Design a protein around this ligand. Structure first.
Ligand SMILES: NC(=O)c1ccc[n+]([C@@H]2O[C@H](COP(=O)([O-])OP(=O)(O)OC[C@H]3O[C@@H](n4cnc5c(N)ncnc54)[C@H](OP(=O)(O)O)[C@@H]3O)[C@@H](O)[C@H]2O)c1
Ligand SMILES: NC(=O)c1ccc[n+]([C@@H]2O[C@H](COP(=O)([O-])OP(=O)(O)OC[C@H]3O[C@@H](n4cnc5c(N)ncnc54)[C@H](OP(=O)(O)O)[C@@H]3O)[C@@H](O)[C@H]2O)c1
Ligand SMILES: C[C@]12CCC(=O)C=C1CC[C@@H]1[C@@H]2CC[C@]2(C)C(=O)CC[C@@H]12
Ligand SMILES: C[C@]12CCC(=O)C=C1CC[C@@H]1[C@@H]2CC[C@]2(C)C(=O)CC[C@@H]12
Lengths: 322, 322
């Protein structure tokens, strides 16, 4: 209980292998993230994933400090992730954005800070800046300079570990090859589930001792207009539903356990007390090789989150094969 | 260095996934055991595996206490395993054997106690009792009764968890189907390596929430007469050597990593300070799907430890398919 399952990252820190997702669609009020994160900690989640752009870090920070102050957990046993939004990729703005997140959290450091998405937009107060014709104002930024600035955040102790999200093979290579590289990314957080299992990019990341962290592992929030409402619903999949019945679990738990067995650190968002608790059952059963092969067979090239609002610049990550 | 990778067992306890093997052939002085377990703890091993029959518990116990007393580690961060030898299967001899191990160790409890080998031999003080012409004297003991005595040792707090070693499918079912079963075995510790990968037994264990723990994962001690001197040397395999070269590791480290990635808890014995430290590097890289498949391909029905001196009784575990 005072113990939990973690993986060693390439900088020597440890990451719990089940993480709590905190993004909620625009219609959901704030008090909701506060209570959900408390419940998550209560249930046994020790890894909590957020971002500046989720507009919840005040509530998330409060939940974590509340659970430390009530004695449920110590700060050392919470692994909190934040992410740098694309209007702060300029290296002059990286540390201020991190300090801005720490101030909202009222925490002294994050355990992990990520580059949220590799397409940069113009700096300023708008998170999606637009021109007088409604066109997104993209910015030309060298992400190797952004990386340098993230490395100095780790040196300052403001982020214990640094990594990336939504990077493809070419963009990881660009960082791993950077002149004067000090710290590799510990992770690449990307969409990953049995309809899009990312085996090629997963193998690339394993070959470089980068951990792949899976978001939308339950099929995503399905929030319009980010996700099309006619994409297939992952947790309705017949093979997952059959395995869940066989195991007396649930399709979600099957989807979660698949990732754990393939060496993926898996996130799961739920703001529902029963499902938050149910998701921790991932550690209570195992899948056989034939079950794991049946789930591998489900891959169908369904990307829920294409984020094509950001397509056009060379750093848009999803037009490459991987 | 206060975190480390563990798996949850079916009784709620946690087992670190790399364990330090302490058996050495007769010719090696027992002082090497004391020194080796101190090095292993110093290198970051938190799981230590021994047995009454290894004749080293006085030394292993002293190593553990020496590292507790020096402030290196706390008792709650060592996972210590002992095993019940076959001269003590009669239920009335199970607790006296556990107490005898605890007195030799000077510990108040083991974290794990296993039935070492399912064939029983005549009770008394010899661990391999022989007749007038040097033949083993076997005994007829109902392992379900043995198991009940094991459950009472767990209830007494003298073993935090209980499990088995060298059990096959049939023998595990015997236990799982016993009327009145209180505690399933948490594990089945068996020979496991790329030449004998146990995929059938491993799948069955995963389906029953039992963790398979691999011994002889580096290809065994190769001690004669227990291991056929003509059997192939695991760590000379060209697939393992090629993956070690690709990874800038060693064939031993590839064999260890393979087990971690298939959900097996792996032991490694070394009494060499350099190799003890090297073996912990298992947490510093990852194998790709392609490399895992290539290692899967090596399976070749080579069992180093046939233990065929115990063949004949029906509980001899290695005749069955799995
Ligand atoms: N790096 C990035 O770009 C990025 C972008 C997106 C997201 N993320 C991170 O990844 C997290 C997870 O991804 P996601 O937000 O898309 O959602 P997800 O985890 O795939 O969850 C999808 C949905 O599953 C439901 N659910 C959860 N547990 C369940 C269970 N046991 N049974 C049935 N349904 C269940 C949730 O509804 P209820 O809440 O009603 O349970 C939720 O709406 C995010 O919250 C965020 O922290 C990162
Ligand atoms: N349950 C049971 O029936 C059972 C029976 C047998 C054993 N076991 C348990 O499992 C343990 C391990 O099995 P094992 O004793 O057969 O041996 P093992 O772990 O397969 O292999 C040990 C041999 O490998 C060498 N070695 C270790 N690390 C190495 C490296 N990095 N590179 C090259 N060589 C390396 C050791 O030599 P050095 O020492 O010289 O380094 C030794 O010669 C035992 O010690 C015991 O704790 C259980
Ligand atoms: C990152 C994000 C949330 C998590 C998710 O899954 C999908 C998106 C895509 C667009 C982001 C959005 C969060 C809020 C943003 C910044 C806006 O206010 C307009 C664009 C939008
Ligand atoms: C059980 C054992 C240890 C670990 C291992 O690898 C397998 C063996 C070989 C046979 C056992 C031995 C321990 C020493 C034994 C018990 C004797 O005193 C005569 C037979 C011999």
């Amino acid at each position: 209980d005072s113990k939990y399952q973690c993986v060693k990252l390439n900088d020597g820190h440890f990451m719990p292998v089940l993480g709590f997702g905190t993004y909620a669609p625009a219609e959901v009020p704030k008090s909701k993230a506060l209570e959900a994160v408390k419940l998550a900690i209560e249930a046994g989640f020790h890894h909590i994933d957020s971002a500046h752009v989720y507009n919840n870090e005040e509530q998330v920070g409060l939940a974590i400090r509340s659970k430390i102050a009530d004695g449920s957990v110590k700060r050392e046993d919470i692994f909190y992730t934040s992410k740098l939004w694309s209007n702060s990729h300029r290296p002059e703005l990286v540390r201020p954005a991190l300090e801005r997140s720490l101030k909202n959290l009222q925490l002294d450091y994050v355990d992990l800070y990520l580059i949220h998405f590799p397409v940069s937009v113009k700096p300023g107060e708008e998170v999606i800046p637009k021109d007088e014709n409604g066109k997104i104002l993209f910015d030309t930024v060298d992400l190797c300079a952004t990386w340098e600035a993230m490395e100095k955040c780790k040196d300052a102790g403001l982020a214990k570990s640094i990594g990336v999200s939504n990077f493809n093979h070419r963009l990881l290579e660009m960082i791993l090859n950077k002149p004067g590289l000090k710290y590799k990314p510990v992770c690449n957080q990307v969409e990953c589930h049995p309809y899009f299992n990312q085996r090629k990019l997963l193998d690339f990341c394993k070959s470089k001792d980068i951990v792949l962290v899976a978001y939308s592992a339950l099929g995503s929030h399905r929030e319009e207009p980010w996700v099309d409402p006619n994409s297939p619903v992952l947790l309705e999949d017949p093979v997952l539903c059959a395995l869940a019945k066989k195991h007396k679990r649930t399709p979600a738990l099957i989807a979660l356990r698949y990732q754990l067995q393939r060496g993926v650190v898996v996130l799961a968002k739920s703001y529902n007390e029963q499902r938050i608790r149910q998701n921790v059952q991932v550690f209570e059963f195992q899948l056989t090789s034939e079950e794991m092969k049946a789930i591998d067979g489900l891959n169908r090239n369904v990307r829920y989150l294409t984020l094509d609002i950001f397509a056009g610049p060379p750093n848009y990550p999803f037009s490459d094969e991987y």
